[PDB]
Design a protein around this ligand. Structure first.
Ligand code: W5K
Ligand code: W5K
Lengths: 208, 197
């Protein structure tokens, strides 16, 4: 009665349609159901009005259908954010599953939009849907991409910043899967520190 | 697979269970010194049974009934205005309540409407549902389910028959479906009903 885990190679092989899905039993179930959110930035609107749920999915094939659809139907607008979160967790730090939590953060420079945004974001998505952090995948809430003019942010959000073992294992595996050099250190920030603006930086509770 | 909750399951969850859709609760007062942008205020969004009940229990305790007001629950991304792309070709099953039935049936009928929406009570035809509107008025209240396409007769009349069943209305009491394009034009004391159940 075990966790459903997909490595990167298996998820890539399941890409590009193909499956007949006979008996509604030929699709590959995910451990969790996931919801894709969009948060727009315009028209003098409340935080709630700008957050929109796009779509939910709980198979590898339906992930790839949505991915292929967004990849062909959507263009990149700064001010926007996309978030993939487990079903029942809103992509806001005030949520019961995020308020005690935080994020592993990747910051991309202006150059790296064109070179690394799509690659790093896909690798992040596969880490989530594939349950890549072993038992510590349960600490994962979701992932956020902030598209910005200064430079783009990609983050894995986790549920509890005081779970050092879980947080640091997520961190180490994520950095490995992004193929980041050991010189490039990524930082974990409590959402409670990120919420308070106190200077040019937020404190990192952990680094890998 | 579609997430469907019957009435009994949703009531059992009242003091997390995902909804098929995310829903947005809107409030609208008729005020001309402010116009349709400032009058229409978003109150809150939700996509679980428990968060529906938290908001319901909150509004039920914290809010008192003012005529001229309207509340609307619509799917996330559909504004509660007929000009919206998802409503302009559509219409509404309308329940009109007399002055007496404000005290007896408003809260009951409105709750039953809400459960039909969040529970996906119309089978595949729940996708034709946009939302629901309650207009609190002195003449007598209005409750309506809004659907996306008035030319989908099969979708529309299934919704109306299930809705009428869930309101526990007698078969003598016939409800009417009105195109938003007919309701927009004031032509007398009544609007034409494209269908009736
Ligand atoms: C920031 C990348 C953004 O780019 C779009 C093409 C618009 O610029 C984007 C957003 C969401 C998803 C997404 C799809 C399926 C499941 C979860 C998801 F988050 C994928 C992408 N991009 C893929 C590569 O283009
Ligand atoms: C019956 C109209 C109004 O009644 C109050 C007395 C108004 O001050 C009302 C409005 C919205 C909601 C509502 C709550 C949660 C989600 C969607 C909703 F539309 C519930 C109610 N009434 C509850 C039962 O009386």
């Amino acid at each position: 009665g075990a966790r459903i885990i997909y490595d990167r190679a298996f998820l890539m092989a399941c890409r590009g349609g193909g499956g007949e899905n006979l008996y509604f039993q030929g699709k590959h179930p995910l451990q969790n159901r996931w919801a894709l959110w969009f948060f727009k930035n315009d028209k003098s609107k409340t935080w709630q009005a700008n957050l929109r749920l796009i779509s939910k999915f709980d198979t590898v094939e339906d992930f790839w259908a949505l991915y292929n659809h967004i990849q062909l139907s959507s263009n990149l607008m700064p001010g926007c954010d996309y978030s993939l979160f487990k079903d029942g967790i809103e992509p806001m730090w005030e949520d019961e599953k995020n308020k005690r939590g935080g994020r592993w953060l990747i910051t991309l420079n202006k150059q790296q939009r064109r070179s690394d945004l799509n690659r790093f974001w896909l690798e992040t998505l596969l880490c989530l849907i594939g349950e890549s952090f072993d038992d510590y995948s349960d600490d994962v809430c979701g992932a956020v991409v902030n598209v910005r003019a200064k430079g783009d942010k990609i983050a894995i959000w986790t549920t509890e910043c005081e779970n050092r073992e879980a947080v640091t294992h997520i961190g180490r595996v994520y950095k490995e899967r992004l193929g980041l050099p050991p010189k490039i250190v990524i930082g974990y920030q409590s959402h409670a520190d990120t919420a308070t603006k106190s200077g040019s930086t937020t404190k990192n509770r952990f680094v890998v």
